């Protein structure tokens, strides 16, 4: 008989501990694995695939239309859309990125925001996208917007433009749930010159917008998502 002493914590059950256990089914042989395409190893692998952002959130019931950012022909100087960058809330929240970020407490890294244009091929347009780093207000006019991170996008044969929100930060991690100290800025978009439709054409054209994370990205300290809850256990 070897002398032992038990410490504080004996008998506790910590849902996060990782130890060995007896197998209830001694000697059982599991089914062989066969090959299946698509294996995922890290959630970091999947948040780099871009998905659509319901940017046009202004509706009243969920609709395919809140994915469409409208553009008006012949407007000059004006603003196309605006949003803050609380990736865990608001427009971002239902996107795959938003949806995964919510399983973690802290995030750090660059984001990739792209816009794909869908107007007739014989039209043309020049837009400016601007990222405003924390510390200033959402820009109120392009002059204000153009003094921060921006890209003049020229609509052409190449249909999409990929803007990166480079990680601009004092503190090396931000909270995924919106927090002030930790806030990330604003994203706005304005006409640089203006949309022009060809003859025989009319109305609004739309941009689709996507979001995905750069390879830069870090997420840490897992927790429970506000995105799902329940009141009684389900049954069959």
């Amino acid at each position: 008989g070897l002398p032992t002493t038990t410490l504080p914590g004996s008998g506790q059950f910590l849902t996060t501990d990782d130890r060995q256990s007896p197998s209830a089914l001694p000697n059982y042989e599991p089914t062989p694995r066969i090959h299946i395409p698509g294996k995922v190893h890290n959630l970091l692998e999947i948040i780099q695939v871009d998905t659509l952002i319901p940017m046009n959130n202004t509706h009243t019931k969920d609709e395919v239309n809140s994915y469409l950012i409208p553009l008006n022909a012949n407007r000059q100087n004006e603003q196309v859309f605006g949003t803050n960058l609380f990736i865990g809330d608001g427009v971002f929240k239902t996107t795959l990125l938003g949806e995964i970020v919510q399983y973690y407490t802290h995030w750090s890294g660059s984001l990739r925001f792209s816009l794909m244009y869908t107007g007739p091929a014989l039209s043309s347009a020049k837009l400016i996208l601007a990222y405003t780093p924390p510390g200033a207000r959402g820009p109120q006019d392009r002059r204000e917007a153009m003094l921060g991170t921006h890209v003049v996008w020229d609509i052409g044969l190449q249909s999409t433009i990929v803007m990166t929100i480079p990680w601009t930060s004092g503190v090396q991690f931000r909270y995924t749930d919106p927090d002030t100290y930790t806030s990330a800025g604003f994203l706005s978009c304005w006409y640089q010159t203006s949309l022009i439709l060809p003859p025989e054409t009319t109305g609004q054209v739309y941009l689709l917008s996507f979001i995905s994370a750069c390879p830069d990205f870090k997420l840490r300290l897992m927790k429970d998502t506000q995105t799902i809850s329940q009141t009684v256990a389900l049954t069959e």
Binding site: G11, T15, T16, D18, S21, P22, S23, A24, L25, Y28, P30, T31, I34, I36, P37, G38, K39, H41, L43, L44, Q48, V49, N56, N57, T58, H59, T60, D62, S66, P70, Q79, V80, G82, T83, K93, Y103, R112, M116, R137, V151, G156, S159, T160, I161, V162, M163, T164, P166, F186, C214, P215, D216, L219, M222, T225, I228, S229, A233, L234, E236
Partner: protein
């Protein structure tokens, strides 16, 4: 590892930021393709986002309850909660369910922890000390009919005996019939016109029956069982879109009617911040 390299002014014919998303690719664009950057290192590995880590902590998967009371004159033990079964599932309490259904096929060993606590809601002189028996009943085994049937002999069926207030813990290998468990199945068990859709044995993980071994004392004792499940040795294939609407049933994808808009409406314009 560098998180960003140093990059300076650019005036090229080589534009990495113009792409065609119609192709289905997400081109790997970085901050340094469109602003001037400085070197910085990652200092991070992405350890805690590994799927083994993501699915590897215990989650509550089931709460049931049984009572110790005089079975004298009870015509239906099962019905008096004299004993109770549970056909194992991971899709009845939604927290773990949403996590698993981020994948289509999943393969893992399970580690179960079972916590049992007792309650004595009406006048008792004391708290008795009860031993619970949890039997693993694979499909085809005789199922308990009374709380003290020959079934409980469990001569070939794994069973664990632990005390109420304590915890029991054991681990079961991946018992799926196929190479992975299907998180989803767009099929039937056969080409029947009325057979159930979606629910499949491809997911089946056994089933478990609980009872108190103790005979009855003078008062009644409520024992409530909580089953926790931890995936170990995880393998996951084919990522899918996360669950947006609420769940209604074990094993079907169905959402409730007149549900509410899941996308938050802006308080303001598209232009609003």
């Amino acid at each position: 590892t560098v998180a960003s390299i140093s990059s300076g002014p650019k005036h090229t014919q080589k534009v990495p930021i113009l792409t065609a998303n119609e192709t289905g690719a997400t081109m790997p664009v970085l901050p340094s393709d469109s602003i001037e950057t400085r070197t910085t290192y990652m200092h991070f590995n992405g350890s805690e986002t590994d799927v083994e880590c993501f699915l590897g902590r215990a989650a509550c998967v089931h709460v049931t309850e049984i009572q110790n009371k005089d079975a004298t004159g009870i015509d239906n033990h099962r019905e008096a909660k004299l004993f109770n079964d549970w056909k194992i599932n991971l899709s009845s309490l939604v927290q773990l369910r949403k996590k698993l259904e981020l994948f289509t096929y999943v393969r893992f060993d399970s580690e179960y922890t079972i916590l049992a606590t007792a309650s004595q809601p009406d006048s008792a002189n004391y708290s008795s000390n009860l031993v619970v028996q949890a039997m693993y009943v694979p499909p085809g085994a005789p199922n308990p009919k009374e709380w003290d049937d020959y079934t409980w002999q469990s001569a070939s069926n794994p069973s664990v005996f632990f005390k109420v207030g304590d915890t029991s813990r054991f681990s079961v290998p991946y018992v799926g019939l196929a190479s992975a468990y299907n998180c989803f199945y767009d099929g039937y068990s056969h080409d029947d016109a009325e057979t159930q859709y979606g629910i499949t044995v491809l997911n089946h993980m056994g089933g478990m029956a609980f009872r108190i071994v103790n005979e009855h004392d003078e008062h009644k004792t409520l024992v409530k069982i909580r089953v926790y499940h931890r995936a170990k040795h995880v393998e996951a294939w084919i990522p899918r879109a996360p669950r947006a609407l609420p769940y209604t049933s074990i094993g079907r994808t169905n959402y409730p009617k007149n549900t509410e808009p899941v996308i938050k409406k802006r308080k303001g314009d598209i232009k609003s911040y």
